[PDB]
Amino acid sequence: SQSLDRLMNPLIDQYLYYLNRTQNQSGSAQNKDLLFSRGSPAGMSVQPKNW
Amino acid sequence: VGNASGNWHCDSTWLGDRVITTSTRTWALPTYNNHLYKQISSASTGASNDNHYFGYSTPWGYFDFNRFHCHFSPRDWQRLINNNWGFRPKRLNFKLFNIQVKEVTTNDGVTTIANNLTSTVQVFSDSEYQLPYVLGSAHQGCLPPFPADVFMIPQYGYLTLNNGSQAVGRSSFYCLEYFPSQMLRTGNNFTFSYTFEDVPFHSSYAHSQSLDRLMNPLIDQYLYYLNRTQNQSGSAQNKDLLFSRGSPAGMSVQPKNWLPGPCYRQQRVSKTKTDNNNSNFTWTGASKYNLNGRESIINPGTAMASHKDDKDKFFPMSGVMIFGKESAGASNTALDNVMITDEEEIKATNPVATERFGTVAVNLQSSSTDPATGDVHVMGALPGMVWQDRDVYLQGPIWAKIPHTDGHFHPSPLMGGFGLKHPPPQILIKNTPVPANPPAEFSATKFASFITQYSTGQVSVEIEWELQKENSKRWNPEVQYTSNYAKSANVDFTVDNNGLYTEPRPIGTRYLTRPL
Amino acid sequence: LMGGFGLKHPPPQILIKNTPVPANPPAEFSATKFASFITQYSTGQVSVEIEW
Amino acid sequence: TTNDGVTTIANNLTSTVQVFSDSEYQLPYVLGSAHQGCLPPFPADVFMIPQ
Numbered sequence: 001s002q003s004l005d006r007l008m009n010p011l012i013d014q015y016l017y018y019l020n021r022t023q024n025q026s027g028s029a030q031n032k033d034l035l036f037s038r039g040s041p042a043g044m045s046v047q048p049k050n051w
Numbered sequence: 052v053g054n055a056s057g058n059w060h061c062d063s064t065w066l067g068d069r070v071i072t073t074s075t076r077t078w079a080l081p082t083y084n085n086h087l088y089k090q091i092s093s094a095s096t097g098a099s100n101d102n103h104y105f106g107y108s109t110p111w112g113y114f115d116f117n118r119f120h121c122h123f124s125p126r127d128w129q130r131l132i133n134n135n136w137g138f139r140p141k142r143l144n145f146k147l148f149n150i151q152v153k154e155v156t157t158n159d160g161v162t163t164i165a166n167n168l169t170s171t172v173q174v175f176s177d178s179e180y181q182l183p184y185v186l187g188s189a190h191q192g193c194l195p196p197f198p199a200d201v202f203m204i205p206q207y208g209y210l211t212l213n214n215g216s217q218a219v220g221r222s223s224f225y226c227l228e229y230f231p232s233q234m235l236r237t238g239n240n241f242t243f244s245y246t247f248e249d250v251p252f253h254s255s256y257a258h259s260q261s262l263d264r265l266m267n268p269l270i271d272q273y274l275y276y277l278n279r280t281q282n283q284s285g286s287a288q289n290k291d292l293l294f295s296r297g298s299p300a301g302m303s304v305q306p307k308n309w310l311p312g313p314c315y316r317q318q319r320v321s322k323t324k325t326d327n328n329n330s331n332f333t334w335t336g337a338s339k340y341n342l343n344g345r346e347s348i349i350n351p352g353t354a355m356a357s358h359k360d361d362k363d364k365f366f367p368m369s370g371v372m373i374f375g376k377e378s379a380g381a382s383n384t385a386l387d388n389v390m391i392t393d394e395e396e397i398k399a400t401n402p403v404a405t406e407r408f409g410t411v412a413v414n415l416q417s418s419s420t421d422p423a424t425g426d427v428h429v430m431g432a433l434p435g436m437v438w439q440d441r442d443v444y445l446q447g448p449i450w451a452k453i454p455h456t457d458g459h460f461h462p463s464p465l466m467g468g469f470g471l472k473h474p475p476p477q478i479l480i481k482n483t484p485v486p487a488n489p490p491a492e493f494s495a496t497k498f499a500s501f502i503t504q505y506s507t508g509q510v511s512v513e514i515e516w517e518l519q520k521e522n523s524k525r526w527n528p529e530v531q532y533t534s535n536y537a538k539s540a541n542v543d544f545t546v547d548n549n550g551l552y553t554e555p556r557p558i559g560t561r562y563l564t565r566p567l
Numbered sequence: 568l569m570g571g572f573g574l575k576h577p578p579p580q581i582l583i584k585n586t587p588v589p590a591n592p593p594a595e596f597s598a599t600k601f602a603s604f605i606t607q608y609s610t611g612q613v614s615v616e617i618e619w
Numbered sequence: 620t621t622n623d624g625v626t627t628i629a630n631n632l633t634s635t636v637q638v639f640s641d642s643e644y645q646l647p648y649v650l651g652s653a654h655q656g657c658l659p660p661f662p663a664d665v666f667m668i669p670q
Contacts, residue, residue, distance in 0.1 A: 001183075001211050001223035004454065005347045008188030010091060010106050011208035012596060013381070015118075015191045015446070017373040017389050018350070019320065020382065023331035032324040036373065036389050037382045039189075045101040045339075048350030048372075050187050050451050050464045052632065059637055079601065081592040151633050155591040161622060164591060164605060166633055191598040201601040203592055237633045507589050551600070569653060579642040580650065583668060586635045606620070609636050615658070 008047060014039035016048050052168065056240045057148030060511050061198055063127050068520060069141075070131070072122040073513040076194045080172070080204040081505045083110045086484040088226070091208070094216035101345045105213030111227050112204035114145075114478040116512055117186050117449045120196035120554070125544045128445050132560050133531045137252030137519035140450070143245035143475055146511035147174060150235050152482070154504040166237075171483045172506050174241050175232035178476040180452070182225055183209035186477065187451040189466060194512070196446065197552035204480060227479060234483065245476070250469050252519050254439055255560040257396035259525070260567035262311055262437060264302065272297035274306050311408075312401040312438020315353040316428035317367040319405035322386060326364075337368050351465050353431075354441050355404035357394045366391055367404040372467070374446055377553045396561040397439045441467040445558045450474045482506050521563050530562045585609050 008014075017036040024033030039047035061075040089108040093099075116122070123131065131138060154167040185207070192205030211222040233241060266272075275294040282291030297305035317338045321327050339348045350369055358365045372392040379388040402408055408430045413423030440463045443449075451464035452474045462470040487500040534543055541547070543555045590603040620627060656669030 001221070002209075003212065003342065005342050005345070006104060006210045006213065007183070007185065008210075009185040009190055009205070009208045010104055010210055011108060011206050012190040012192060013598070014189050015375055015598075016189050016350075017375060017379070017384070019333055019368055021331060022320070022324075022327065022333050023329075030329055032327055032329065034320075034322070034324055034327075034386055035382075036384050036386075037380075038375065040381070041104070042097075043102060044104060045099075045345065045347045048189060048466055049347070050466050051454060051459075055635055059639075077587060077589070079589040079592045081594060083594070085594075149586075149635060151588065153588075153591070162591075163620065166631065168633070192596060195600075201587060201589055201604075203596060203598075203601065206596050505591050509586075576644070577648070577650070579640045579644065580646060580648060581640050582638070582646075584637045586637055588631065588634060605631075607631055607634065609634075613658075 004051060005049065006044065007049075008039075008044065010041045010044075013041075014047055018046060018048070052238050054238065055149065056238060057146060057509065057511070059509065060146075060513070063124065065130070068518050070127075070138075070516045070518060071513065072127065072516065073511065074116070074122055074194060074198070075509055075511045076198065077201045077507065077509055078114075078204055079201065079505065079507045080112050080480060080482060082482050082484075082501075082503065083112065083206045084108055086110050086501060092213070092216045092218075096216075098216075100215060101347070103213055103215045103345065104210055105216065105218045105222065106208060106210035107224060109207045109209075109227055111207040111479045111481045113185075113207045114480065114510065115186055115190070115192060115205065116194045117189075117451075118193045118196075118446060119443065119449055120446045121194040122512070122514055123445070125445070128558060129532055131518070132255060132558070132562055133529075134521065134563075135518045136256045136521040136563060136565060138255060139250055139252050139517050140247040140469065141515040141517050142513075143247065143515075144511075144513035145243040145245070145478065146513075147235075147241035147480075147508070148511070149508045150237050150239060150506065151508055152237060152504060152506040154485075154502060156503070167485065167502075167504055168237055170485060170504065170506075171234040171236050173232040173234050173481045173483055174479065175227075175230050176243055176476045176478050177230075180473070180476065182227070182230075182477060182479075183211075184452045184474070184477060185209060186474070187464070189448050194510075195552075196554065197546075200552065207477075207479060227481070230479075232479075232481075243478070247475075248471055248473055250471065252517075253443055253469070253560065255519075256521070256563050256565045257530075257561040258399040258439075258567045259564045261399040262309060262567065263307065265307075265567065266297075266302065266305060268299045268302075271299075272305055276304060276306070308435070309437045310433055310435050312355075312436055313353050313431040314355060314402045314408040314427070314429065315349070315431075316407065317349075317352070317355075317370045317404050319365050320368050322364050322366070333368070351441060351467070353401075353404075354397065354438060354463075355394075355401050356398040357392075357404060359398065359403050359406065363393070363395075365405065366393075370404040372441075372444065372447065372557070374444075374557050377551065390557050392442075392444060392557050392559070394442065396442070396559070399439075399567065401438045441465065442559045442561055443467045444560075446554060447557070521565070523563070523565060525564055529564060532558060532562055 017038045020037035021035045024031045059075050060073050064071045091108050092105045093103040152167050152170040153164050155164045195202050212219045275296045278295035279293045282289045318336050337348050339346050374390045376388045408427040410424040413425050448466050448468045450469045450471050453462045453470045453472050464470050485502045487502050546552050588605045590605050659666050
């Protein structure tokens with residue numbers, strides 16, 4: 001009744017982070033930089049799984 | 052009513068080959084979804100066929116302590132590390148007491164809170180694993196690592212078979228109200244005991260030898276191998292076949308007996324942006340798997356080393372555990388607001404996540420320009436493999452329910468920890484709805500006038516951990532986790548002037564050594 | 568030096584604390600540190616018997 | 620609770636106060652220093668508990 005990639009709770013974020021954006025937008029078209037974000041129902045395909 | 056329902060049991064006890072940790076925290080639980088179940092999905096949103104979902108939202112909350120720091124203290128975590136080759140869960144004792152149901156009302160700015168003595172809060176344990184298990188996913192809302200802290204109970208929500216923001220017929224909708232639950236008033240309580248299944252000890256040790264370096268550096272081998280196929284002699288090239296036997300001189304060519312662990316190569320990323328390639332390869336570059344159309348990125352996948360040699364500045368794009376930093380944001384946030392784990396004590400058995408596994412032939416040499424040695428970026432299996440698993444961390448996960456299927460492979464939770472067929476069951480809690488004043492004549496319409504109220508109370512969790520003392524005749528001292536004896540304005544793992552507990556950095560468990 | 572008796576094991580410290588009672592929480596989860604508590608105090612008697 | 624000058628005090632029957640004795644001397648002993656906040660020499664007097 002559940003897909004391996006869809007087990008997490010669709011109401012709670014994760015206390016884990018991951019590399020969100022490596023381009024860094026700001027109006028300079030491109031400016032490298034490193035940014036991270038924590039999992040969320042918003043983006044499930046990028047959350048850390050277990051299997 | 053006027054009598055305590057339980058005491059504050061929180062402490063640790065060290066007993067030779069066993070340690071018992073007991074934690075107690077104050078919790079708070081608000082009414083969720085206004086006593087309603089709701090259908091949720093990715094319908095009419097940012098879309099993306101790789102982020103679609105279909106599930107439901109329950110008015111229930113749940114207790115979770117799947118984080119190590121919920122039980123062990125920094126000091127305790129240290130004692131465990133510096134002195135034990137391994138450890139495992141054993142028994143579990145859950146207590147729920149001092150139920151305080153508060154009733155709240157507001158009017159014209161005035162907000163007064165009162166006690167609803169004659170109110171109940173429902174609790175039950177899914178000890179049959181009939182409900183969707185959502186503790187395997189490293190979510191927030193667990194017991195605060197700091198005892199004095201107060202936390203809220205996370206809301207329960209599950210997902211089912213979804214077809215792009217649209218469910219199927221074989222999808223499942225569960226009602227938690229269809230479960231027998233124990234109702235508790237202010238003078239009641241709830242206890243529960245659990246027994247962890249038999250699982251292997253966690254590797255709290257680091258190998259003293261590399262898989263490729265086991266042989267005796269003083270003795271040759273009675274085995275030979277093709278040494279040179281060119282044959283030097285002054286004719287530039289003259290074919291011929293020559294063999295030689297292994298020797299300390301050439302260890303990389305000696306016949307071994309085993310092979311490094313599996314490998315699923317990922318892209319490399321430097322901490323120094325100035326060293327990084329341009330563009331946003333976060334997605335289009337990362338490694339992911341394809342599951343029924345919608346493909347998902349791969350977090351810590353195959354247990355592979357983070358960085359090699361000195362290059363401690365590199366790390367897999369999505370092959371390492373990254374924890375927050377108290378004040379860190381949700382979307383933005385730079386390096387100085389995150390903590391990246393360094394899987395290093397694994398370079399002796401497991402390959403490097405960024406580099407290749409090895410090289411393989413691709414053709415023959417029959418008058419054909421040989422060879423064909425091609426790089427390997429994905430392996431797995433092969434009789435003779437030997438590898439270590441991902442290390443656990445103080446703020447890291449603990450256990451994870453092993454999916455019930457026809458088969459699996461080394462069911463070690465990729466995020467680290469223990470894989471349990473029957474893990475600590477989900478403990479669900481819910482405030483009983485108290486309808487406000489009804490009409491004066493019947494109305495078969497669905498009631499919707501409820502008295503807003505919440506509840507608070509304490510909760511105790513006792514866990515017995517079996518240790519595994521170390522037995523090494525290693526002469527030289529060992530590597531130990533220690534605090535910087537140097538002068539400092541802030542003491543690690545404490546509180547600031549504003550009163551806020553912060554965890555300086557993540558801590559592994561592999562410091563002691565053992566011969567491979 | 569201030570006078571009295573020197574005890575290796577003197578009368579232990581007796582610590583007391585009011586249990587925090589969180590005020591009405593939100594309607595949706597927030598992993599942020601809770602800070603909305605109901606202000607309250609406590610009073611009572613205390614007896615001490617000593618045989619000299 | 621207080622509001623617009625109005626200050627009313629009520630009973631929280633369902634409330635608890637925690638107590639314990641450091642009988643193992645694990646915590647810093649601060650009774651050696653002649654501090655104030657002890658039991659009032661006069662029985663009828665009322666005192667506050669030192670922090």
